[PDB]
Amino acid sequence: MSNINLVQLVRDSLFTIGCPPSIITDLDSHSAITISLDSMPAINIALVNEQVMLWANFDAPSDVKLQSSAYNILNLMLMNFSYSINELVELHRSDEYLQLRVVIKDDYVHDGIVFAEILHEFYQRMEILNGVL
Amino acid sequence: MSNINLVQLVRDSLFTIGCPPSIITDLDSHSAITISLDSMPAINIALVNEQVMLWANFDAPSDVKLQSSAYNILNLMLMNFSYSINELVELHRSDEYLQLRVVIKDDYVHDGIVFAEILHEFYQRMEILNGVL
Ligand SMILES: [Cl-]
Ligand SMILES: [Cl-]
Ligand SMILES: [Cl-]
Ligand SMILES: [Cl-]
């Protein structure tokens, strides 16, 4: 009914990573949470169908850029992600963005220390994608 | 419970596609169903946690083959698939295979005519992957 517990989870996770809660923002008690990052798209976190979803919107690359970076991107996408409901991080393409998305299993969203590791790994996947875009 | 309703769904779908229910095989009433195809991996279909999953196992390509085919595989994986729970067909490393996998939304597994289109599109994606491996 509210994002209050998700906000607290993210906050708790950031104490463990070593970042301040000043980078965490939201619109209201029902919106997605945003973690602003330097030189990278923000990490968005929200409850979608009672499941925690993390996503990042990268500016969509041209077809030719995707071609020169395809091997690197494919290898990234084939990497298992243990906390995901399907064991993977997903890539969704729209006209404007190439979006990295993952839906986390309920087993891992009730412990800020574990969620810190999830955020850290998602950030690492984002770093790899950012480096080849 | 059992794969009886799923077997009936699959065989019904095949009549609509123009194939016989002879290409449909299974081990018993609790196993996955397998549709044998000529010159391509079989299509596997099973109920996994009350959800219908389709998957096909392709022999995993070497690293050098992946380098040349990465762009085509990536383009394929970014294609929307409307019947999937995440709007995509998934690609997983699975033992010695590259596996195409999709979990179908419950909305589309009670009508053999609709499921026929699902099988047809999954087969089309398999054809695309097969052509670059
Ligand atoms: Cl939560
Ligand atoms: Cl982070
Ligand atoms: Cl069913
Ligand atoms: Cl078919």
User: Touching check for B73 and chain A: CB below 8 Å?
Assistant: yes
* Domain count for chain B: 1
- The rounded distance, in Å, linking the Cα atoms of B37 and B52 is 20
Cβ–Cβ below 8 Å for A66 and B74: yes
For residues A54 and A116, the answer to whether their CB atoms sit within 8 Å is: no
Return the amino acid letter for B20: P
Q: Which residue among B73, B75, B86 sits closest to A90, beta carbon to beta carbon?
A: B86
**Nominal resolution (angstroms):** 1.8
Give phi and psi for A23, each to the nearest 5: -85, -10
B13 burial type by CB count under 10 A (0-12 exposed, 13-18 middle, 19+ buried) = buried
A90-93 vs A97-104, strand pairing mode: antiparallel
**Domain limits for position B93:** 1-133
Q: Give the Cα-Cα-Cα angle B106, B87, B6 (nearest 5 degrees).
A: 30
CA angle A88, B82, B47 (to 5 degrees): 65
Question: Is the CB of A71 less than 8 angstroms away from the CB of B73?
Answer: no
Q: Compute, in degrees rounded to 10, the torsion defined by CA atoms B5, B10, B15, B18.
A: 180
Task: Give the 3-state secondary structure of residue A49.
Answer: coil
CATH for B36: 3.30.1460.10
Instruction: Give whole-number Cα distances, A24 to A27, A32, A107, A117, B89, in Å.
Output: 11, 11, 23, 17, 33
CA distance B22 to B121: 20
Q: Output the six-digit token pair for A35.
A: 């973690």
Tokens of A100: 């990295």
Buried b (16+ CB within 10 A) or exposed e, B88-122: bbbbbeeeeebbbbbbbeeeebeebebbbbbbebb
- The minimal CB distance from A88 to the residues B74, B92, B103 is found for B92
Structure letter (DSSP) for residue A51: E
CB-based contact A20:A13 (threshold 8 Å): no
How far is residue A91's CA from residue A98's CA, in Å, rounded to a whole number? 7
Q: Which of A39, A22, A6 is nearest to A133 (CA)?
A: A39
User: How many residue contacts between A and B have a Cβ separation below 8 Å?
Assistant: 42
Kindly report the CA angle at B26 between B22 and B32, in degrees rounded to 5? 125
